[PDB]
Ligand binder design. Structure first.
Ligand SMILES: *O[C@H]1CCO[C@@H]1COP(=O)(O)O
Ligand code: NI
Length: 291
DNA sequence: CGACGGATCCG
DNA sequence: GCTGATGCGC
DNA sequence: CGGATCCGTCGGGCGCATCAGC
């Protein structure tokens, strides 16, 4: 059973088709084409993902042979890094772990690479949400965006504080070299990125305030949503809530993105989703960027 | 988080 | 010290 | 009027830190 190949939407369109990674993906590049492969996955507790499947990271390298793996919601403490650092995967010696010191066992991002970055820096310019990694031709920012929560308590903090600082961080990097922004942006951009847009108008993640900041602070600053631009009018989800068993019915959201600067957006070859990989409420997404 | 009614618009 | 029960915020 | 909004409230599943009880 492949529920992601079936189109589930409350207000769909005739031109829309459900994402099928078997058929809707292009084939890999010729052996030797200078490129870089990046994967992103919200693990919803990395210690819980490994208790479920120990080889979750290895089975990604076996299926895609990525160069860089970006993670969100690792829910790791600063003391838990070294033990995970040795038992997650081999051959990726450059792993950087930003953990949350405010709330313990909460949030937490990571960037695990096999190519040595020129420089890595957490935060802008506490909850482990920003990891900027410099490379020979581009920055790579792995981001886990905070949620407004029940009652939209942090909605003003999300719009006037987080989305503004995140945008200014990305543009200051573009002054040097282009940007590949990945991670859990925690926002369903358009109505095609959610199965029930009408029923979540006031729900955190699909509020109009968050959706306008998705365009203003991010896309309208010279950026492209690779998956949407590669597959215009194609429904694909990267999240399914446990509360309603949404993964068995494909009733989900698209919260994980690969936003790439206009400079190198043409060099994007594939922006895919792997909805068959279980172990978390999210599923991994990938990017194949030509160099 | 999304499901499910009651109650407000509203053209 | 180890296992289960509890309360939290996605 | 009556379909299309808005909105009040619950039932709900999970990874973590924490906590007492054995
Ligand atoms: O249920 C979704 C809608 C808004 O945020 C949650 C996703 O939570 P994350 O696990 O992406 O932080
Ligand atoms: Ni989550």
């Amino acid at each position: 059973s492949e529920p992601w190949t079936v189109l589930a939407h409350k207000k769909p369109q005739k031109d829309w088709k459900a994402y099928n990674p078997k058929t809707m993906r292009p084939p890999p590049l010729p052996e030797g084409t200078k490129c870089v492969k990046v994967m992103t996955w919200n693990v919803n507790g990395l210690r819980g993902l490994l208790k479920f499947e120990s080889f979750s990271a290895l089975q990604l390298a076996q299926r895609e042979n990525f160069d860089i793996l970006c993670l969100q919601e690792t829910k790791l403490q600063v003391k838990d890094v070294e033990e995970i650092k040795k038992t997650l995967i081999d051959g990726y010696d450059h792993s950087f772990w930003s953990c949350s010191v405010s709330k313990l066992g909460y949030s937490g991002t990571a960037i695990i690479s096999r190519i040595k970055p020129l420089s890595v820096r957490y935060g802008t310019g506490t909850e482990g949400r920003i990891v900027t990694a410099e490379f020979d031709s581009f920055y790579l920012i792995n981001t886990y965006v905070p949620n407004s929560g029940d009652g939209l308590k942090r909605l003003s903090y999300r719009i006037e504080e987080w989305d503004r600082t995140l945008s200014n961080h990305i543009k200051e990097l573009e002054k040097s070299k282009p940007v590949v922004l990945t991670g859990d942006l925690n926002c369903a951009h358009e109505e095609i990125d959610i199965f029930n847009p009408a029923g979540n108008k006031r729900s955190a993640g699909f509020t109009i305030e968050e959706r306008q900041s998705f365009g203003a602070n991010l896309l309208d600053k010279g950026f492209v949503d690779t998956f949407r631009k590669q597959h215009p009018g194609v429904v694909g989800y990267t999240y399914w809530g446990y509360r309603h068993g949404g993964r068995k019915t494909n009733k989900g959201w698209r919260l994980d993105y690969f936003l790439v600067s206009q400079s190198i957006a043409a060099n994007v070859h594939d922006s895919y989703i792997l909805p068959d990989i279980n172990g978390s409420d999210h599923c991994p997404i990938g990017l194949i960027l030509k160099l």
